[PDB]
Curated annotation (Swiss-Prot):
Residues 1-167 form the Macro domain. May form homohexamers. Interacts with N protein. Changing residue 164 to L: In strain: Gamma/P.1. It is a multi-pass membrane protein. It catalyses: Thiol-dependent hydrolysis of ester, thioester, amide, peptide and isopeptide bonds formed by the C-terminal Gly of ubiquitin (a 76-residue protein attached to proteins as an intracellular targeting signal). Changing residue 31 to A: In strain: Mu/B.1.621. It comes from Severe acute respiratory syndrome coronavirus 2 (2019-nCoV). This is Papain-like protease nsp3. Responsible for the cleavages located at the N-terminus of the replicase polyprotein. Participates together with nsp4 in the assembly of virally-induced cytoplasmic double-membrane vesicles necessary for viral replication. Antagonizes innate immune induction of type I interferon by blocking the phosphorylation, dimerization and subsequent nuclear translocation of host IRF3. Also prevents host NF-kappa-B signaling. In addition, PL-PRO possesses a deubiquitinating/deISGylating activity and processes both 'Lys-48'- and 'Lys-63'-linked polyubiquitin chains from cellular substrates. It is found in: Host endoplasmic reticulum membrane. The chain holds residues 1025 to 1191 of 7096 of the full protein. Inhibited in vitro by GRL-0617.
Length: 167
């Protein structure tokens, strides 16, 4: 039993809800919130910009130190950093950004990072401003993640389309 509320159950391990991931994190304080990161951990817009804003830029300050020490992530890769006021940990995961010409096949590799954590709050990787089809992202999620994932879909219209089209 966990404290996630109001989710529709899609499979044994995947749950979905129309929600603002910032507000969800602030309410649940999950062990792990997933950020839709880029390789530079520059949290400008979309989920990343919103999460970082909610931390009063502390996420960005921590991320800049991480990059200065370690260099950029790989597309499809991840790192674990602090969750600040939102969660115990933030798993920064880089899905491919179609608006940059990156290979959509890397979306499965990106979701594989979730399997290192028993329970996660997360957005659909590569969706939104990353330019992929969210219906495809949900399919890859369900077919790749084996741990318990609670997906927050900000756009209510998109949420209804994902539910109604889910196979
Ligand atoms: C599927 C979602 C989306 C939103 C709008 C237009 C199309 C798609 C997603 C895409 O990355 N973005 C978010 N999801 C959850 N919580 C969020 N908080 C701030 C952003 C955000």
């Amino acid at each position: 039993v966990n404290s996630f509320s109001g989710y529709l159950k899609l499979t044994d391990n995947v749950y979905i809800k129309n929600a603002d991931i910032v507000e969800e994190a602030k309410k649940v304080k999950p062990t792990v919130v997933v950020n839709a990161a880029n390789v530079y951990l520059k949290h400008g817009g979309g989920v990343a910009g919103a999460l970082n804003k909610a931390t009063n830029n502390a996420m960005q300050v921590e991320s800049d130190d991480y990059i200065a020490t370690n260099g950029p992530l790989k597309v499809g890769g991840s790192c674990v950093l602090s969750g600040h006021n939102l969660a115990k940990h933030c798993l920064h995961v880089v899905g491919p950004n179609v608006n940059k010409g990156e290979d959509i096949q890397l979306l499965k590799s990106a979701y594989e990072n979730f399997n290192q954590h028993e329970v996660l709050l997360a957005p659909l990787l590569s969706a939104g401003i990353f330019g992929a089809d969210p219906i495809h992202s949900l399919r890859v999620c369900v077919d790749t993640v084996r741990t318990n994932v609670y997906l927050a879909v900000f756009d209510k219209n998109l949420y209804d389309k994902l539910v109604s089209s889910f196979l």
